[PDB]
């Protein structure tokens, strides 16, 4: 609950790296992993699909 | 903006300090400060009013 819900209704998958100004990993309880991006063309905030290949490589270039 | 929303739809102003098991400030762009609490016996996760005096009394110790 009523008061609390996950900030991402769904994940968007047609967002290109060149379009995103910032990326943030939301740490909200009882919610799956959530990456939030600040945009261009619109400039809004979107929840991006973590399975995006470019997000994967980006998150993977954080070590092994 | 069709996908992202603030995780708190409203704040709960009647919760007592005795009832809260855990508190967590949420990192959340384009939203006001938001505090999530886990309730003691039923374990529900609720958004609680930052304006609550005991919440202040805690954040003012920082
Ligand atoms: Au962001
Ligand atoms: Au438009
Ligand atoms: Au919590």
Count CB atoms within 10 A of the CB of residue B28: 21
The resolution, in angstroms to one decimal, equals 2.2
At residue B39, the 3 state secondary structure works out as strand
Closest to B50 (Cα-Cα) out of B41, B61, B59, B40:
B59
The size of chain B, in residues, is: 62
Q: How far is the CA of B44 from the centre of ligand 1 (A)?
A: 28
Residue with tokens 């938001």: B34
**How many separate helices (H) and strands (E) can be counted in chain B?**
1, 3
**How many separate domains does chain A show?**
1
Alpha helices per DSSP H over chain B = 53-59
DSSP E strand boundaries for chain B:
20-25, 35-39, 45-48
d(CA B58, CA B62): 8
Residue among B4, B24, B45 whose CB faces A36 most closely: B4
CATH number at residue B37: 2.40.50.40
d(CA B14, CA A17): 44
| Residue A47 near chain B (CB below 8 Å) | yes
The DSSP element (H or E) to which A45 belongs, if any, is: strand A45-48
d(CA B18, CA B15): 8
Residue with tokens 């991402």: A8
- Cβ separation of A11 and B1 shorter than 8 Å? no
Partners of B3 on chain A (C-beta within 8 Å) are: 8-12, 46-47
At residue A29, the 3 state secondary structure works out as coil
Q: How far is the CA of A59 from the centre of ligand 2 (A)?
A: 31
Q: What are phi and psi of B53, to 5 degrees?
A: -55, -45
Residue A55 neighbours by CB under 8 Å, 6+ apart = A23, A35, A48, A49
Domain span at residue A55 reads 1-64
d(CA A19, CA A38): 9
Q: How far is the CA of B49 from the centre of ligand 3 (A)?
A: 14
A50, HSE (Cβ side, Cα atoms, 13 Å): 10
d(CA B40, CA B20): 5
């Amino acid at each position: 609950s009523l008061s609390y819900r996950c900030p991402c209704r769904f994940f968007e998958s047609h967002v290109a790296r060149a379009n995103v100004k910032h990326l943030k990993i939301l740490n909200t309880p009882n919610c799956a992993l959530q990456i939030v991006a600040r945009l261009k063309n619109n400039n809004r905030q979107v929840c991006i699909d973590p399975k995006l290949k470019w997000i994967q490589e980006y998150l993977e270039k954080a070590l092994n």
